[PDB]
PDB file of all heavy atoms in Angstrom:
ATOM      1  N   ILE A 253      26.314   1.387   6.676  1.00 39.58           N
ATOM      2  CA  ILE A 253      24.908   1.692   6.219  1.00 39.58           C
ATOM      3  C   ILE A 253      25.092   2.455   4.913  1.00 39.58           C
ATOM      4  O   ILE A 253      25.918   3.335   4.852  1.00 39.58           O
ATOM      5  CB  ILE A 253      24.178   2.522   7.270  1.00 39.58           C
ATOM      6  CG1 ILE A 253      24.122   1.792   8.572  1.00 39.58           C
ATOM      7  CG2 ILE A 253      22.691   2.820   6.822  1.00 39.58           C
ATOM      8  CD1 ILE A 253      23.426   2.613   9.746  1.00 39.58           C
ATOM      9  N   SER A 254      24.355   2.150   3.897  1.00 39.47           N
ATOM     10  CA  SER A 254      24.369   2.951   2.766  1.00 39.47           C
ATOM     11  C   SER A 254      22.912   3.267   2.221  1.00 39.47           C
ATOM     12  O   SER A 254      22.015   2.624   2.624  1.00 39.47           O
ATOM     13  CB  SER A 254      25.220   2.335   1.607  1.00 39.47           C
ATOM     14  OG  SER A 254      24.757   1.051   1.220  1.00 39.47           O
ATOM     15  N   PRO A 255      22.889   4.196   1.207  1.00 40.79           N
ATOM     16  CA  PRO A 255      21.492   4.479   0.763  1.00 40.79           C
ATOM     17  C   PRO A 255      21.186   3.548  -0.525  1.00 40.79           C
ATOM     18  O   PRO A 255      22.060   2.878  -1.055  1.00 40.79           O
ATOM     19  CB  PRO A 255      21.741   5.968   0.194  1.00 40.79           C
ATOM     20  CG  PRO A 255      23.184   6.135   0.030  1.00 40.79           C
ATOM     21  CD  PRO A 255      23.825   5.158   0.945  1.00 40.79           C
ATOM     22  N   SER A 256      19.913   3.348  -0.703  1.00 40.66           N
ATOM     23  CA  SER A 256      19.403   2.615  -1.833  1.00 40.66           C
ATOM     24  C   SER A 256      18.531   3.445  -2.496  1.00 40.66           C
ATOM     25  O   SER A 256      18.054   4.515  -1.910  1.00 40.66           O
ATOM     26  CB  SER A 256      18.680   1.336  -1.345  1.00 40.66           C
ATOM     27  OG  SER A 256      17.798   0.724  -2.217  1.00 40.66           O
ATOM     28  N   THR A 257      18.275   3.322  -3.818  1.00 39.29           N
ATOM     29  CA  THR A 257      17.182   4.120  -4.516  1.00 39.29           C
ATOM     30  C   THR A 257      15.756   3.665  -4.174  1.00 39.29           C
ATOM     31  O   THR A 257      14.887   4.511  -4.216  1.00 39.29           O
ATOM     32  CB  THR A 257      17.330   4.043  -6.110  1.00 39.29           C
ATOM     33  OG1 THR A 257      17.621   2.726  -6.496  1.00 39.29           O
ATOM     34  CG2 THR A 257      18.454   4.956  -6.496  1.00 39.29           C
ATOM     35  N   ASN A 258      15.526   2.302  -3.999  1.00 37.78           N
ATOM     36  CA  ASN A 258      14.226   1.725  -4.050  1.00 37.78           C
ATOM     37  C   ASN A 258      13.895   0.741  -2.940  1.00 37.78           C
ATOM     38  O   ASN A 258      12.672   0.210  -3.010  1.00 37.78           O
ATOM     39  CB  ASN A 258      14.241   0.875  -5.373  1.00 37.78           C
ATOM     40  CG  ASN A 258      15.382  -0.133  -5.336  1.00 37.78           C
ATOM     41  OD1 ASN A 258      16.502   0.201  -5.177  1.00 37.78           O
ATOM     42  ND2 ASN A 258      15.025  -1.429  -5.660  1.00 37.78           N
ATOM     43  N   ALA A 259      14.585   0.623  -1.942  1.00 38.04           N
ATOM     44  CA  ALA A 259      14.377  -0.443  -0.837  1.00 38.04           C
ATOM     45  C   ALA A 259      15.095  -0.128   0.397  1.00 38.04           C
ATOM     46  O   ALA A 259      16.179   0.477   0.413  1.00 38.04           O
ATOM     47  CB  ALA A 259      14.643  -1.818  -1.371  1.00 38.04           C
ATOM     48  N   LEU A 260      14.478  -0.541   1.541  1.00 35.68           N
ATOM     49  CA  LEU A 260      15.214  -0.667   2.763  1.00 35.68           C
ATOM     50  C   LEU A 260      15.545  -2.047   2.835  1.00 35.68           C
ATOM     51  O   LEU A 260      14.639  -3.006   2.823  1.00 35.68           O
ATOM     52  CB  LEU A 260      14.268  -0.255   3.901  1.00 35.68           C
ATOM     53  CG  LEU A 260      15.097   0.093   5.139  1.00 35.68           C
ATOM     54  CD1 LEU A 260      14.156   0.984   6.045  1.00 35.68           C
ATOM     55  CD2 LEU A 260      15.528  -1.091   5.935  1.00 35.68           C
ATOM     56  N   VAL A 261      16.900  -2.430   2.912  1.00 34.72           N
ATOM     57  CA  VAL A 261      17.289  -3.778   2.839  1.00 34.72           C
ATOM     58  C   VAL A 261      17.973  -4.167   4.180  1.00 34.72           C
ATOM     59  O   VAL A 261      19.078  -3.622   4.432  1.00 34.72           O
ATOM     60  CB  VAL A 261      18.277  -4.162   1.636  1.00 34.72           C
ATOM     61  CG1 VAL A 261      18.448  -5.542   1.497  1.00 34.72           C
ATOM     62  CG2 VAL A 261      17.639  -3.522   0.306  1.00 34.72           C
ATOM     63  N   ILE A 262      17.397  -5.144   4.883  1.00 35.57           N
ATOM     64  CA  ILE A 262      18.046  -5.798   5.977  1.00 35.57           C
ATOM     65  C   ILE A 262      19.010  -6.794   5.499  1.00 35.57           C
ATOM     66  O   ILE A 262      18.719  -7.952   5.163  1.00 35.57           O
ATOM     67  CB  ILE A 262      16.937  -6.269   7.008  1.00 35.57           C
ATOM     68  CG1 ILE A 262      16.123  -5.259   7.634  1.00 35.57           C
ATOM     69  CG2 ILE A 262      17.687  -7.033   8.229  1.00 35.57           C
ATOM     70  CD1 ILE A 262      14.797  -5.604   8.212  1.00 35.57           C
ATOM     71  N   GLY A 263      20.213  -6.436   5.358  1.00 35.99           N
ATOM     72  CA  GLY A 263      21.278  -7.045   4.760  1.00 35.99           C
ATOM     73  C   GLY A 263      21.959  -8.045   5.862  1.00 35.99           C
ATOM     74  O   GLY A 263      21.602  -8.084   6.992  1.00 35.99           O
ATOM     75  N   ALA A 264      23.063  -8.578   5.246  1.00 34.03           N
ATOM     76  CA  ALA A 264      23.830  -9.567   6.124  1.00 34.03           C
ATOM     77  C   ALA A 264      24.420  -8.958   7.456  1.00 34.03           C
ATOM     78  O   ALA A 264      24.438  -9.602   8.482  1.00 34.03           O
ATOM     79  CB  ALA A 264      24.930 -10.159   5.277  1.00 34.03           C
ATOM     80  N   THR A 265      24.986  -7.660   7.355  1.00 32.50           N
ATOM     81  CA  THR A 265      25.481  -7.025   8.602  1.00 32.50           C
ATOM     82  C   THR A 265      24.480  -6.999   9.706  1.00 32.50           C
ATOM     83  O   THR A 265      24.780  -7.181  10.809  1.00 32.50           O
ATOM     84  CB  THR A 265      26.080  -5.729   8.291  1.00 32.50           C
ATOM     85  OG1 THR A 265      25.033  -4.787   7.809  1.00 32.50           O
ATOM     86  CG2 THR A 265      27.159  -5.748   7.290  1.00 32.50           C
ATOM     87  N   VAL A 266      23.149  -6.757   9.481  1.00 32.59           N
ATOM     88  CA  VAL A 266      22.055  -6.843  10.500  1.00 32.59           C
ATOM     89  C   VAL A 266      21.720  -8.295  10.756  1.00 32.59           C
ATOM     90  O   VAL A 266      21.595  -8.676  11.969  1.00 32.59           O
ATOM     91  CB  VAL A 266      20.877  -6.103  10.018  1.00 32.59           C
ATOM     92  CG1 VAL A 266      19.781  -6.160  10.926  1.00 32.59           C
ATOM     93  CG2 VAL A 266      21.091  -4.580   9.603  1.00 32.59           C
ATOM     94  N   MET A 267      21.646  -9.196   9.845  1.00 34.95           N
ATOM     95  CA  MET A 267      21.345 -10.572   9.994  1.00 34.95           C
ATOM     96  C   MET A 267      22.422 -11.372  10.888  1.00 34.95           C
ATOM     97  O   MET A 267      22.128 -12.339  11.499  1.00 34.95           O
ATOM     98  CB  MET A 267      21.125 -11.421   8.647  1.00 34.95           C
ATOM     99  CG  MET A 267      19.976 -10.952   7.854  1.00 34.95           C
ATOM    100  SD  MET A 267      19.926 -11.860   6.217  1.00 34.95           S
ATOM    101  CE  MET A 267      19.363 -13.387   6.866  1.00 34.95           C
ATOM    102  N   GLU A 268      23.604 -10.766  10.781  1.00 33.48           N
ATOM    103  CA  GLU A 268      24.671 -11.234  11.754  1.00 33.48           C
ATOM    104  C   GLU A 268      24.354 -10.996  13.198  1.00 33.48           C
ATOM    105  O   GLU A 268      25.015 -11.566  14.053  1.00 33.48           O
ATOM    106  CB  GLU A 268      25.980 -10.583  11.354  1.00 33.48           C
ATOM    107  CG  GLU A 268      26.491 -11.198  10.014  1.00 33.48           C
ATOM    108  CD  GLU A 268      27.913 -10.601   9.556  1.00 33.48           C
ATOM    109  OE1 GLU A 268      28.223  -9.447   9.974  1.00 33.48           O
ATOM    110  OE2 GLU A 268      28.618 -11.323   8.858  1.00 33.48           O
ATOM    111  N   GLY A 269      23.244 -10.201  13.383  1.00 35.25           N
ATOM    112  CA  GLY A 269      22.938  -9.947  14.724  1.00 35.25           C
ATOM    113  C   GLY A 269      21.919 -11.032  15.277  1.00 35.25           C
ATOM    114  O   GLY A 269      21.585 -10.985  16.487  1.00 35.25           O
ATOM    115  N   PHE A 270      21.330 -11.954  14.397  1.00 35.14           N
ATOM    116  CA  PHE A 270      20.084 -12.671  14.745  1.00 35.14           C
ATOM    117  C   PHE A 270      20.140 -13.995  14.062  1.00 35.14           C
ATOM    118  O   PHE A 270      20.927 -14.299  13.215  1.00 35.14           O
ATOM    119  CB  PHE A 270      18.919 -11.915  14.281  1.00 35.14           C
ATOM    120  CG  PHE A 270      18.800 -10.618  14.913  1.00 35.14           C
ATOM    121  CD1 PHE A 270      19.415  -9.566  14.162  1.00 35.14           C
ATOM    122  CD2 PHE A 270      18.219 -10.310  16.097  1.00 35.14           C
ATOM    123  CE1 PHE A 270      19.367  -8.194  14.732  1.00 35.14           C
ATOM    124  CE2 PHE A 270      18.294  -9.062  16.629  1.00 35.14           C
ATOM    125  CZ  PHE A 270      18.856  -8.064  15.945  1.00 35.14           C
ATOM    126  N   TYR A 271      19.200 -14.923  14.558  1.00 32.40           N
ATOM    127  CA  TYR A 271      18.817 -16.064  13.920  1.00 32.40           C
ATOM    128  C   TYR A 271      17.562 -15.613  13.296  1.00 32.40           C
ATOM    129  O   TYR A 271      16.652 -15.100  13.750  1.00 32.40           O
ATOM    130  CB  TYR A 271      18.591 -17.308  14.881  1.00 32.40           C
ATOM    131  CG  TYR A 271      18.207 -18.465  14.327  1.00 32.40           C
ATOM    132  CD1 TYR A 271      18.938 -19.159  13.260  1.00 32.40           C
ATOM    133  CD2 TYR A 271      17.027 -19.195  14.769  1.00 32.40           C
ATOM    134  CE1 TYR A 271      18.559 -20.336  12.763  1.00 32.40           C
ATOM    135  CE2 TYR A 271      16.672 -20.493  14.206  1.00 32.40           C
ATOM    136  CZ  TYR A 271      17.491 -21.063  13.311  1.00 32.40           C
ATOM    137  OH  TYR A 271      17.090 -22.284  12.765  1.00 32.40           O
ATOM    138  N   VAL A 272      17.624 -15.900  11.849  1.00 32.06           N
ATOM    139  CA  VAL A 272      16.521 -15.466  10.897  1.00 32.06           C
ATOM    140  C   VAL A 272      15.880 -16.638  10.343  1.00 32.06           C
ATOM    141  O   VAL A 272      16.428 -17.480   9.703  1.00 32.06           O
ATOM    142  CB  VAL A 272      17.019 -14.431   9.872  1.00 32.06           C
ATOM    143  CG1 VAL A 272      15.809 -13.795   9.160  1.00 32.06           C
ATOM    144  CG2 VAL A 272      17.866 -13.382  10.512  1.00 32.06           C
ATOM    145  N   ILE A 273      14.548 -16.724  10.517  1.00 31.02           N
ATOM    146  CA  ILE A 273      13.633 -17.784  10.044  1.00 31.02           C
ATOM    147  C   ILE A 273      12.788 -17.327   8.855  1.00 31.02           C
ATOM    148  O   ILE A 273      11.927 -16.462   8.950  1.00 31.02           O
ATOM    149  CB  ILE A 273      12.822 -18.418  11.170  1.00 31.02           C
ATOM    150  CG1 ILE A 273      13.786 -18.805  12.308  1.00 31.02           C
ATOM    151  CG2 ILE A 273      11.901 -19.544  10.726  1.00 31.02           C
ATOM    152  CD1 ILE A 273      13.743 -17.954  13.473  1.00 31.02           C
ATOM    153  N   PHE A 274      12.983 -18.008   7.730  1.00 31.44           N
ATOM    154  CA  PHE A 274      12.162 -17.726   6.466  1.00 31.44           C
ATOM    155  C   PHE A 274      11.078 -18.774   6.461  1.00 31.44           C
ATOM    156  O   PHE A 274      11.259 -19.866   5.742  1.00 31.44           O
ATOM    157  CB  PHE A 274      13.094 -17.726   5.278  1.00 31.44           C
ATOM    158  CG  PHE A 274      14.142 -16.595   5.251  1.00 31.44           C
ATOM    159  CD1 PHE A 274      15.448 -16.777   5.947  1.00 31.44           C
ATOM    160  CD2 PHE A 274      13.932 -15.317   4.641  1.00 31.44           C
ATOM    161  CE1 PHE A 274      16.308 -15.740   5.955  1.00 31.44           C
ATOM    162  CE2 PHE A 274      14.910 -14.313   4.753  1.00 31.44           C
ATOM    163  CZ  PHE A 274      16.078 -14.555   5.222  1.00 31.44           C
ATOM    164  N   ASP A 275      10.001 -18.484   7.125  1.00 32.30           N
ATOM    165  CA  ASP A 275       8.806 -19.347   7.244  1.00 32.30           C
ATOM    166  C   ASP A 275       7.817 -19.055   6.124  1.00 32.30           C
ATOM    167  O   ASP A 275       6.891 -18.379   6.265  1.00 32.30           O
ATOM    168  CB  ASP A 275       8.139 -19.292   8.632  1.00 32.30           C
ATOM    169  CG  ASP A 275       7.225 -20.311   8.991  1.00 32.30           C
ATOM    170  OD1 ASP A 275       6.821 -21.105   8.034  1.00 32.30           O
ATOM    171  OD2 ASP A 275       6.665 -20.449  10.178  1.00 32.30           O
ATOM    172  N   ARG A 276       8.087 -19.621   4.948  1.00 33.90           N
ATOM    173  CA  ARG A 276       7.264 -19.433   3.713  1.00 33.90           C
ATOM    174  C   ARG A 276       5.849 -20.235   3.981  1.00 33.90           C
ATOM    175  O   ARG A 276       4.838 -19.686   3.581  1.00 33.90           O
ATOM    176  CB  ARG A 276       7.922 -19.985   2.609  1.00 33.90           C
ATOM    177  CG  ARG A 276       9.253 -19.362   2.245  1.00 33.90           C
ATOM    178  CD  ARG A 276      10.258 -20.281   1.632  1.00 33.90           C
ATOM    179  NE  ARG A 276       9.821 -20.867   0.438  1.00 33.90           N
ATOM    180  CZ  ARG A 276       9.909 -20.200  -0.821  1.00 33.90           C
ATOM    181  NH1 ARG A 276      10.478 -19.044  -0.909  1.00 33.90           N
ATOM    182  NH2 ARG A 276       9.471 -20.947  -1.805  1.00 33.90           N
ATOM    183  N   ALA A 277       5.845 -21.369   4.666  1.00 31.44           N
ATOM    184  CA  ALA A 277       4.642 -22.168   4.980  1.00 31.44           C
ATOM    185  C   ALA A 277       3.688 -21.213   5.640  1.00 31.44           C
ATOM    186  O   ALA A 277       2.515 -21.292   5.288  1.00 31.44           O
ATOM    187  CB  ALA A 277       4.873 -23.333   5.791  1.00 31.44           C
ATOM    188  N   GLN A 278       4.048 -20.473   6.618  1.00 29.83           N
ATOM    189  CA  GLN A 278       3.158 -19.547   7.376  1.00 29.83           C
ATOM    190  C   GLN A 278       3.330 -17.998   6.962  1.00 29.83           C
ATOM    191  O   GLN A 278       2.752 -17.079   7.657  1.00 29.83           O
ATOM    192  CB  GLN A 278       3.343 -19.793   8.850  1.00 29.83           C
ATOM    193  CG  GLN A 278       3.581 -21.293   9.102  1.00 29.83           C
ATOM    194  CD  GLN A 278       3.310 -21.672  10.583  1.00 29.83           C
ATOM    195  OE1 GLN A 278       2.415 -21.143  11.197  1.00 29.83           O
ATOM    196  NE2 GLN A 278       4.035 -22.614  11.141  1.00 29.83           N
ATOM    197  N   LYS A 279       3.964 -17.724   5.961  1.00 28.39           N
ATOM    198  CA  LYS A 279       4.115 -16.347   5.340  1.00 28.39           C
ATOM    199  C   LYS A 279       4.629 -15.416   6.435  1.00 28.39           C
ATOM    200  O   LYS A 279       4.051 -14.343   6.629  1.00 28.39           O
ATOM    201  CB  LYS A 279       2.780 -15.987   4.716  1.00 28.39           C
ATOM    202  CG  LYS A 279       2.888 -14.982   3.555  1.00 28.39           C
ATOM    203  CD  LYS A 279       1.493 -14.538   3.211  1.00 28.39           C
ATOM    204  CE  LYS A 279       1.421 -13.382   2.241  1.00 28.39           C
ATOM    205  NZ  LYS A 279       0.268 -13.176   1.543  1.00 28.39           N
ATOM    206  N   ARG A 280       5.683 -15.689   7.063  1.00 30.81           N
ATOM    207  CA  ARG A 280       6.324 -14.876   8.076  1.00 30.81           C
ATOM    208  C   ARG A 280       7.824 -15.102   8.135  1.00 30.81           C
ATOM    209  O   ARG A 280       8.276 -16.038   7.786  1.00 30.81           O
ATOM    210  CB  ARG A 280       5.750 -15.240   9.497  1.00 30.81           C
ATOM    211  CG  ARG A 280       5.871 -16.755   9.815  1.00 30.81           C
ATOM    212  CD  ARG A 280       4.976 -17.158  11.025  1.00 30.81           C
ATOM    213  NE  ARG A 280       5.441 -18.433  11.510  1.00 30.81           N
ATOM    214  CZ  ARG A 280       5.126 -18.945  12.706  1.00 30.81           C
ATOM    215  NH1 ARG A 280       4.160 -18.337  13.545  1.00 30.81           N
ATOM    216  NH2 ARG A 280       5.461 -20.264  13.023  1.00 30.81           N
ATOM    217  N   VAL A 281       8.458 -14.031   8.757  1.00 29.07           N
ATOM    218  CA  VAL A 281       9.867 -14.109   8.950  1.00 29.07           C
ATOM    219  C   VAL A 281      10.043 -14.065  10.428  1.00 29.07           C
ATOM    220  O   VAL A 281       9.493 -13.051  11.097  1.00 29.07           O
ATOM    221  CB  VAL A 281      10.579 -12.957   8.300  1.00 29.07           C
ATOM    222  CG1 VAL A 281      12.061 -12.938   8.620  1.00 29.07           C
ATOM    223  CG2 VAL A 281      10.350 -13.036   6.823  1.00 29.07           C
ATOM    224  N   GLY A 282      10.838 -14.836  11.027  1.00 30.52           N
ATOM    225  CA  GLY A 282      11.093 -14.847  12.473  1.00 30.52           C
ATOM    226  C   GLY A 282      12.619 -14.321  12.652  1.00 30.52           C
ATOM    227  O   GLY A 282      13.530 -14.553  11.991  1.00 30.52           O
ATOM    228  N   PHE A 283      12.716 -13.743  13.841  1.00 31.84           N
ATOM    229  CA  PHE A 283      13.918 -13.173  14.381  1.00 31.84           C
ATOM    230  C   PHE A 283      14.150 -13.730  15.805  1.00 31.84           C
ATOM    231  O   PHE A 283      13.212 -13.646  16.593  1.00 31.84           O
ATOM    232  CB  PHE A 283      14.011 -11.653  14.384  1.00 31.84           C
ATOM    233  CG  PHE A 283      14.014 -11.044  13.069  1.00 31.84           C
ATOM    234  CD1 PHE A 283      12.804 -10.822  12.405  1.00 31.84           C
ATOM    235  CD2 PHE A 283      15.163 -10.755  12.490  1.00 31.84           C
ATOM    236  CE1 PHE A 283      12.760 -10.266  11.156  1.00 31.84           C
ATOM    237  CE2 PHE A 283      15.156 -10.283  11.248  1.00 31.84           C
ATOM    238  CZ  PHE A 283      14.017  -9.901  10.475  1.00 31.84           C
ATOM    239  N   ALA A 284      15.335 -14.022  16.231  1.00 30.31           N
ATOM    240  CA  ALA A 284      15.615 -14.398  17.409  1.00 30.31           C
ATOM    241  C   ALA A 284      17.029 -14.139  17.807  1.00 30.31           C
ATOM    242  O   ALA A 284      17.854 -13.979  16.904  1.00 30.31           O
ATOM    243  CB  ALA A 284      15.343 -15.900  17.729  1.00 30.31           C
ATOM    244  N   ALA A 285      17.420 -13.919  19.169  1.00 25.14           N
ATOM    245  CA  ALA A 285      18.680 -13.843  19.581  1.00 25.14           C
ATOM    246  C   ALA A 285      19.532 -15.056  19.297  1.00 25.14           C
ATOM    247  O   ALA A 285      19.142 -16.186  19.363  1.00 25.14           O
ATOM    248  CB  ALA A 285      18.768 -13.466  21.119  1.00 25.14           C
ATOM    249  N   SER A 286      20.883 -14.769  18.984  1.00 26.60           N
ATOM    250  CA  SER A 286      21.722 -15.731  18.420  1.00 26.60           C
ATOM    251  C   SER A 286      22.962 -15.774  19.297  1.00 26.60           C
ATOM    252  O   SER A 286      23.688 -14.717  19.448  1.00 26.60           O
ATOM    253  CB  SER A 286      22.100 -15.289  16.877  1.00 26.60           C
ATOM    254  OG  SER A 286      23.202 -16.212  16.451  1.00 26.60           O
ATOM    255  N   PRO A 287      23.287 -16.926  19.876  1.00 26.02           N
ATOM    256  CA  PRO A 287      24.588 -17.140  20.577  1.00 26.02           C
ATOM    257  C   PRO A 287      25.786 -16.676  19.805  1.00 26.02           C
ATOM    258  O   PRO A 287      26.751 -16.182  20.516  1.00 26.02           O
ATOM    259  CB  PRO A 287      24.581 -18.649  20.672  1.00 26.02           C
ATOM    260  CG  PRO A 287      23.199 -19.229  20.582  1.00 26.02           C
ATOM    261  CD  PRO A 287      22.536 -18.192  19.588  1.00 26.02           C
ATOM    262  N   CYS A 288      25.969 -16.869  18.562  1.00 25.19           N
ATOM    263  CA  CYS A 288      27.159 -16.566  17.743  1.00 25.19           C
ATOM    264  C   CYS A 288      27.246 -15.051  17.418  1.00 25.19           C
ATOM    265  O   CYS A 288      28.238 -14.566  16.896  1.00 25.19           O
ATOM    266  CB  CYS A 288      27.248 -17.471  16.672  1.00 25.19           C
ATOM    267  SG  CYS A 288      26.423 -16.939  15.184  1.00 25.19           S
ATOM    268  N   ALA A 289      26.258 -14.317  17.715  1.00 23.95           N
ATOM    269  CA  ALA A 289      26.237 -12.841  17.558  1.00 23.95           C
ATOM    270  C   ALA A 289      26.965 -12.134  18.591  1.00 23.95           C
ATOM    271  O   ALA A 289      26.282 -11.565  19.477  1.00 23.95           O
ATOM    272  CB  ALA A 289      24.740 -12.267  17.228  1.00 23.95           C
ATOM    273  N   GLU A 290      28.321 -12.326  18.566  1.00 25.29           N
ATOM    274  CA  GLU A 290      29.091 -11.732  19.596  1.00 25.29           C
ATOM    275  C   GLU A 290      30.520 -11.302  19.085  1.00 25.29           C
ATOM    276  O   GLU A 290      30.819 -11.803  17.935  1.00 25.29           O
ATOM    277  CB  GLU A 290      29.230 -12.669  20.832  1.00 25.29           C
ATOM    278  CG  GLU A 290      28.135 -12.511  21.870  1.00 25.29           C
ATOM    279  CD  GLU A 290      28.081 -13.666  22.841  1.00 25.29           C
ATOM    280  OE1 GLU A 290      29.084 -14.441  22.933  1.00 25.29           O
ATOM    281  OE2 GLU A 290      27.069 -13.810  23.668  1.00 25.29           O
ATOM    282  N   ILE A 291      30.958 -10.444  19.532  1.00 25.28           N
ATOM    283  CA  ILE A 291      32.349  -9.951  19.401  1.00 25.28           C
ATOM    284  C   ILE A 291      33.099 -10.043  20.657  1.00 25.28           C
ATOM    285  O   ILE A 291      32.842  -9.069  21.621  1.00 25.28           O
ATOM    286  CB  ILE A 291      32.536  -8.574  18.658  1.00 25.28           C
ATOM    287  CG1 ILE A 291      32.082  -8.661  17.287  1.00 25.28           C
ATOM    288  CG2 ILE A 291      33.822  -7.958  18.723  1.00 25.28           C
ATOM    289  CD1 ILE A 291      31.672  -7.454  16.495  1.00 25.28           C
ATOM    290  N   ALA A 292      34.141 -10.903  20.873  1.00 24.81           N
ATOM    291  CA  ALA A 292      34.886 -11.017  22.079  1.00 24.81           C
ATOM    292  C   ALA A 292      33.891 -11.299  23.193  1.00 24.81           C
ATOM    293  O   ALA A 292      33.946 -10.720  24.435  1.00 24.81           O
ATOM    294  CB  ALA A 292      35.672  -9.812  22.530  1.00 24.81           C
ATOM    295  N   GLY A 293      32.875 -12.118  22.937  1.00 26.29           N
ATOM    296  CA  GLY A 293      31.842 -12.540  23.881  1.00 26.29           C
ATOM    297  C   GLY A 293      30.814 -11.428  24.269  1.00 26.29           C
ATOM    298  O   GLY A 293      29.919 -11.577  25.079  1.00 26.29           O
ATOM    299  N   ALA A 294      30.984 -10.130  23.579  1.00 24.41           N
ATOM    300  CA  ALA A 294      30.145  -8.971  23.865  1.00 24.41           C
ATOM    301  C   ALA A 294      28.943  -9.144  22.842  1.00 24.41           C
ATOM    302  O   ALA A 294      29.009  -9.370  21.640  1.00 24.41           O
ATOM    303  CB  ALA A 294      30.855  -7.768  23.863  1.00 24.41           C
TER     304      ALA A 294
END
């Protein structure tokens, strides 16, 4: 985690936790649990 001057940024280290949907058609972002977000199956 690091500081920014101007933004809170949900970067790749957080997106590695989830399946992320960029639904521009409906102006929304989706998040869901992701099977591959595991370390040693945890």
Side-chain angles (χ1 to χ4, degrees):
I253 306 176
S254 60
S256 163
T257 45
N258 56 310
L260 200 157
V261 190
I262 296 162
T265 62
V266 182
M267 295 177 74
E268 288 179 336
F270 304 90
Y271 180 52
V272 192
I273 304 106
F274 297 86
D275 195 351
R276 299 144 62 82
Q278 323 201 31
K279 210 186 167 165
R280 56 188 192 172
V281 176
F283 292 90
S286 170
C288 85
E290 270 168 14
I291 284 166

